Amino acid sequence: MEIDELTALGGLLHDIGKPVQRAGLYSGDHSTQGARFLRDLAENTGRAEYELLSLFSENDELMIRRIKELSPERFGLTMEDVLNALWIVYEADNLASPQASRPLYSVFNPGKAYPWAELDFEKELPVPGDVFSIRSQDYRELVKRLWEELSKAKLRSDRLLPVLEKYLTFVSSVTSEGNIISLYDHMRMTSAIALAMLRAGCTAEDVRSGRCRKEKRFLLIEGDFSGIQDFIYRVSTLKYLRARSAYLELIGWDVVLEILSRLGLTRANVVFNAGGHFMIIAQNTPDAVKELEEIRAKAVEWLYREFESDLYLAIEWEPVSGREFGREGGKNLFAEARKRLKHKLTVRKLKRFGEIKGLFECNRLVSLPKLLGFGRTAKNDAGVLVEGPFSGFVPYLQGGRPVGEQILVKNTLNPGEIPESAQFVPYFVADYFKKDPKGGVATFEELSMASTGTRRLGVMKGDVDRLGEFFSSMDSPSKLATASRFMDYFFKGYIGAIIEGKFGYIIGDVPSLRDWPEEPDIVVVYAGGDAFFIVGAWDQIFELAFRVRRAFNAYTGGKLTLSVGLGYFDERTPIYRMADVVSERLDTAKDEGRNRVFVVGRSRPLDGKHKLSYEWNHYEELWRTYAPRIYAGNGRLKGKLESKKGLLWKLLEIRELYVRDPNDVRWAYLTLSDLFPELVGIDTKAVERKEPQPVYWVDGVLKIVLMAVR
Amino acid sequence: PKFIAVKLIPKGPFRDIPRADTLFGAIGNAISAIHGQSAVEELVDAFVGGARISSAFPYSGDTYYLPKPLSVEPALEGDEEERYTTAKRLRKAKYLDLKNFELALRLRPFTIPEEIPYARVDVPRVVLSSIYFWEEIRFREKSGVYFLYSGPREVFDGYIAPAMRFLGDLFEVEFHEMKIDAPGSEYSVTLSNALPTKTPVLWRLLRKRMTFIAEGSIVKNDPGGMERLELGLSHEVYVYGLTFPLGVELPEG
Ligand SMILES: [Mn+2]
Ligand SMILES: [Mn+2]
């Protein structure tokens, strides 16, 4: 052990008492009882580091003596080293941020609460539901799986963080009403802030006087990529497109892990890393700002040489004090510090590649379905398949051994069989794809060929509404850490499940053209942060928009909303054009309000009264109303309409005369006519409300049914 | 200051809205076809000597549009839900009308054009099979494109006017006086895409291979520069990258 590992593991295990008190294993307050749990665990297996680590959950007389009994020399530490570590972690607990049965209340909707479960993307969708007490039996089962895993883990934050995340994700950090903070998130942020305070040269006297709290000894480091949809879409195939997306994820991790390495920080110091956007809490030493300047410049110089002006990385950092991690006198200082950091990033994005003074004077990615992750090695190394700005990336396959100081491991919190010396880095990626008759990812052509009726490629781009404002309303680092993680995990964790046809009772009846296949004709280009780009059989993509919107409504408390752009294209349309159209349509969905979907391209009056988008509920109602009367399912019209298909086409012609001029009363004169009663009359509540006639809306259903039946 | 506005009245659609480099190119080519390279050299001399042309901007009837100065992107804060929503649409706006441009130069509140007088229609065609697109620019009624000239009238009458008439033979040409009120300032916006001599204040890169600063970029006393090069053609070729500066008030940031 050295002071850095001790302060990092101490921050992590400070509040491990909470789960053991709540399970009624011992007697006493969470403080005393957490000390007992680790002391007891230390004696079992025989790892004395846990008895050292047990000191964190507890005049300074008794303390100095208890530390002295645990011989500090044994671990290569001083007595005065450990006192700092404890005092540092004590403040770190306060900065990061009562019945013993209260569950975790949802950051999305504090009125609703999570059933107790372990974080598992293959089990069931987290749904904030009715407030239920958690049984003192459930905590006991948690604590015993927890004890069994700490017993086998290497006592390195990269081996501790994962087991704390599995089991303490759906646990209230404090058992108050409307507590939003996951215990895991409070633990990782305390460790983050604690290790930062250490590196800031802060010491016990400083913590005692507040000359750490009331002084700018921290850095908020934000990194946003710029030129992404230029870097990913706007190529020259679906294979290559997934390779670019995967490449941008590795490039990002290479910068983040480089920063953590050089500042002497842990993965816990990563507040978030989603959609090419990362945030890190760090020390404010002259040494660290110099290390960041070197990193910022070497990363940009590499991006410029490798991809020209296409992809830029804007990196900024702001000096920040303990005060600013928390609310002070009704002012959210943390949001106020984030806002000032946001501003520096916007300025840096307007000084693109200004870190090069020389400014004003595709086979490796093709080769890029049996791998478990990548090793972060030297650039000059055998097996390196792709290179990032700082390091080479060797693919780690099931049959083979991993290679490098860091191993990036895909879609697990279990180190697997990697060497003890190698840093475990779990990364989640939404990588669902329809498997070909060959084991390879299907093509635009094969996806389009699998559609009901018309052969078109389905393309949907989705994006959460007003996320920025939601994150701005997070009081503390640990709160922000829960919001960002829960948000990212919906897209990275559960979209695969939603595609597989899970969460049927949660989702319910959605607009649909066919029975949901067991292996859907869907391929994810990207899903992370608060956004997705997905392609597939047009009719399956149409349905997946409604599935994903409802799963997200349930996953939030019905308190956050999506907007979606949908596109149905000839399979030969180049990617760049498909991306730009679904982007224009997503943007439109947001201009016209949010919580709406661009279902299909539509004619309309340009009188500023007629939106192209639909409100999700308005389209879902329209579909329930009209679809069953005209559509039998699985590519088939109703029998009554087999000879009367033209009636559907005549309505779309009637609707065009409403679009020619929605004031002229000819579409009335024109209108079994008991098939569409809501469209015959001249709706008057609409005329007064200054809103469109029901006839305006019907195309959204009819055009989709006609594509299905052709 | 006051400028000559060269109005291109379009006789059908346009491939793109031309920027200062392409406009100077076309004009240098036209002057070579009329007066020989002796006149091209006098043109370059006039421009190196202080004469400038802007990139082309849309107009609609009596409405001249100019590029949004990048100065106001980081200033926009100068309701909660309303402000983030407008700020995203101001941030996306490429053009302001003259009145709202002159206000943006002074960091005073300003509004955006609701509808822009051109639509990008990219038309698809099948090639034997695949689909390709040709960007076309469709002009609303009595709408089109204009650029500004600053410098002596004799250089305008002697080179720019005759060249622009030649280039018209897709468009006809007419010119009017235009006044832009701009604050006195250490800092200026470029109304032309430029090859900078100094690192600029705020900018968007423009890849063409040359690295240009886009229209709307902010510089401090940067005249830009012209480049001559040899491409194996009969004549040496000049690349226009001079700044067309108007004073611009910057926020302290
Ligand atoms: Mn987004
Ligand atoms: Mn969003």
Swiss-Prot record, chain A:
Cofactor note text: Ni(2+) and Mn(2+), but not Mg(2+), Ca(2+), Zn(2+), Co(2+), or Cu(2+), is required for ssDNase activity.
Cofactor(s) this protein requires: a divalent metal cation
Biological process according to GO: defense response to virus
MF terms in GO: ATP binding; endonuclease activity; exonuclease activity; identical protein binding; transferase activity
Domain GGDEF stretches: 455-602
Keyword terms of this UniProt record: Antiviral defense, ATP-binding, Endonuclease, Exonuclease, Hydrolase, Nuclease, Nucleotide-binding, Transferase
InterPro entries: Cas10-Cmr2_palm2, Cas10/Csm1, Cas10/Csm1_subtype-III-A, Csm1_B, GGDEF_dom, HD_domain, Rev_trsase/Diguanyl_cyclase
Gene3D superfamilies: 3.30.70.270
Location of the HD domain: 1-97
EC identifiers of the protein: 3.1.-.-, 2.7.7.-
PANTHER family, sorted: CRISPR SYSTEM SINGLE-STRAND-SPECIFIC DEOXYRIBONUCLEASE CAS10/CSM1 (SUBTYPE III-A), CRISPR SYSTEM SINGLE-STRAND-SPECIFIC DEOXYRIBONUCLEASE CAS10_CSM1 (SUBTYPE III-A)
Family: Belongs to the CRISPR-associated Cas10/Csm1 family.
Function of the protein: CRISPR (clustered regularly interspaced short palindromic repeat) is an adaptive immune system that provides protection against mobile genetic elements (viruses, transposable elements and conjugative plasmids). CRISPR clusters contain spacers, sequences complementary to antecedent mobile elements, and target invading nucleic acids. CRISPR clusters are transcribed and processed into CRISPR RNA (crRNA).
Extra remark: Encoded in a type III-A CRISPR locus.
Subunit structure: Probably part of the Csm effector complex, that includes Cas10, Csm2, Csm3, Csm4, Csm5 and mature crRNA. Will form a homodimer in solution, interacts with Csm4, which is a tighter, better association than the homodimeric Cas10 and uses the same interface for interaction.
Entry text on domains: The N-terminal HD domain has ssDNase activity. The C-terminal GGDEF domain has the cOA synthesis activity.
Protein name: CRISPR system single-strand-specific deoxyribonuclease Cas10/Csm1 (subtype III-A)
Source organism (scientific name): Thermococcus onnurineus (strain NA1)
From Swiss-Prot, chain B:
Keywords in alphabetical order: Antiviral defense, RNA-binding
RNA-binding as UniProt keyword: yes
Disulfide feature: none
Domain of life per record: Archaea
GO-annotated molecular function: RNA binding
GO biological process, one term: defense response to virus
NCBIfam families assigned: cas5_csm4
Assembly, per entry: Probably part of the Csm effector complex, that includes Cas10, Csm2, Csm3, Csm4, Csm5 and mature crRNA. Interacts with Cas10 (csm1).
More about this protein: Encoded in a type III-A CRISPR locus.
Job description of the protein: CRISPR (clustered regularly interspaced short palindromic repeat) is an adaptive immune system that provides protection against mobile genetic elements (viruses, transposable elements and conjugative plasmids). CRISPR clusters contain spacers, sequences complementary to antecedent mobile elements, and target invading nucleic acids. CRISPR clusters are transcribed and processed into CRISPR RNA (crRNA). The subunit probably binds to the 5' handle of the crRNA, helping in discrimination between self- and non-self.
Family, per entry: Belongs to the CRISPR-associated Csm4 family.
Name of the protein in its database record: CRISPR system Cms protein Csm4
